[PDB]
């Protein structure tokens, strides 16, 4: 007997840990090399001093985990090394129940490869993996603390729920019906954290000096200071000076990472040798791409279009309940005023009869997927659903990915 091990293979950070553990760990799934060829791995990337031109190699080419080599390296580093990761150590893998996560639309061959390697090479006793939206309805099984907002004012899983999974790669609209996503109505919003970081790079480089290479600097900027307009783009643009902020550039002799200051608030003076970049419009004009892709000259339909289409493609009888039970998750949703604005726009688009209740977890929304996945893993539903090592051995390798987990079973 052993508690299941849960790992969330993020395309930008990996959230993993034993089911008994309270809070998960972090693992930047990216192989880096600096200008002088010295290569950094996983959390070593956070330890870089030559920020300027560090190049990031990743296993997820386009949201699809293609290159196994670095995936295996990162897995082995995070699973084996106990010293950095609070003593957690996957001794040898055999006789360990593993619940994992993957991109909601993975190629059948890629999923076959994934199941084959994770089963034969790692030799786990049992394995489950699926998109986080599959685990989202299970939130009923535990007393979660998730704040909720309604758009019309200022048996261990929920049968009807709609999941918006906004991560590093892409924003997914995944409606799940009684724990199986309605895969023909699944719609992908191509906007995501990678795009948003690139747009930050672009607009910083246009308005100020060229920051096109300063990957970790712009990432720290994005972490420190972005927000969606509380009402509309016009409202934020009118008071740009009132809500203006300045970000202090990193000083390699004192701080490899920069930081943001609020000019209005009283704070310590900056040294005269420190270069400062003021942000007055890019704070809100960049996040507004989500609702108005024309702003950043993108022909794709936006988030409200995508959500309304996904609602439309659903069965008529169930779609109002799906509207009422929409839940938001992912790294991107943590940025302020995104959930409120999305709820307001969604209610404004829908007929007055229906009401939308939007619930987003408090705190860092990226960690929510790991939490709900773990709380699901400790339920009888996981015990019934899970597939065993010998049962995989009995079937030919395509059988598992084509029946147990992958989209192919339905479509």
């Amino acid at each position: 007997e052993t508690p299941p091990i849960v790992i969330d293979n993020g395309s930008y950070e990996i959230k993993f840990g034993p089911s008994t553990n309270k809070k998960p760990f972090r693992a930047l799934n990216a192989l880096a090399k600096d200008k002088f060829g010295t290569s950094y791995l996983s959390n070593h990337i956070k330890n870089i001093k030559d920020i300027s031109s560090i190049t990031f190699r990743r296993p997820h080419e386009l949201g699809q985990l293609t290159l196994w080599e670095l995936e295996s390296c990162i897995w082995d580093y995070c699973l084996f090394n106990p010293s950095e990761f609070d003593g957690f150590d996957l001794k040898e893998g055999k006789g360990h129940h593993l619940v994992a996560s993957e991109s909601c639309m993975t190629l059948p061959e890629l999923s076959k490869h994934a199941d084959q390697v994770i089963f034969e090479e790692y030799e786990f006793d049992s394995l489950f993996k699926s998109p986080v939206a599959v685990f989202v309805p299970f939130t009923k099984s535990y007393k979660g603390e998730m704040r909720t907002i309604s758009g019309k004012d200022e048996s261990d899983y929920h049968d009807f729920q709609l999941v918006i999974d906004s991560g590093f790669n892409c924003t997914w609209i995944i409606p799940v019906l009684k724990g199986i996503p309605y895969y023909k109505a699944v719609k992908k919003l191509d906007i995501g954290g990678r795009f948003l970081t690139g747009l930050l790079k672009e607009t910083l480089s246009f308005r100020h000096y060229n920051m096109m290479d300063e990957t970790i600097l712009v990432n720290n900027i994005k972490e420190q200071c972005l927000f969606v307009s509380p009402v509309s783009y016009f409202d934020s643009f009118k008071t740009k000076d009132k809500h203006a902020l300045e970000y202090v550039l990193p000083d390699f002799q004192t701080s490899f990472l920069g930081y943001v200051r609020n000019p209005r608030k009283e704070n310590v003076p900056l040294p005269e040798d420190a270069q400062i970049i003021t942000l007055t419009d890019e704070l809100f004009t960049i996040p507004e791409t989500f609702f108005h892709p024309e702003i950043s000259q993108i022909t794709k339909p936006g988030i409200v279009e995508a959500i309304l289409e996904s609602l439309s493609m659903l069965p008529e009888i169930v779609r109002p309940l799906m509207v009422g039970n929409i839940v938001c998750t992912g790294g991107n949703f943590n940025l302020p005023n995104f959930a409120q604005r999305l709820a307001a726009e969604l209610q404004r688009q829908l007929p007055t009869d229906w009401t939308c209740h939007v619930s987003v977890p408090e705190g860092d929304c990226a960690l929510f997927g790991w939490e709900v996945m773990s709380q699901f893993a400790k339920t009888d539903s996981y015990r019934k659903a899970r597939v065993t090592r010998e049962e995989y051995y009995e079937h030919g390798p395509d059988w598992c990915t084509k029946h147990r987990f992958g989209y192919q079973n339905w479509i």
Binding site: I180, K184, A185, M313, E316, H403, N409, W410
Partner: protein, 126 residues
Amino acid sequence: SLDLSALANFPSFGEYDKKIVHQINTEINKDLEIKIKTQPPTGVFLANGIRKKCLITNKECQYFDPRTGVPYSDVEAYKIIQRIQDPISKEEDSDDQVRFKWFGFKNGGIYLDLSQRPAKGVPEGF
């Protein structure tokens, strides 16, 4: 009300079969009105009142298939068309059943039954 019974039929985190996807498409099709520009030709008669000639048999067409819109002369014609449809003859010697396949020829294509027994004397691999 019947949709609620259909909803209970929907997969419930189990091992359910593809047939649901047909219902899914049924709901999906409801998204918008169909902007069919030009209505397809219908019926068994020409504009002058003369009966159409069967494409299968060259007999004068007697009936018209409302689902596919292919007019047919006789029951045999309809059956042959249906066998062209339903490629997997779900009887579930099964491979010996008439299996029409389409072969592309210079400037056009023809339907060929791979179960056709060729003339006596064909070599191995014919």
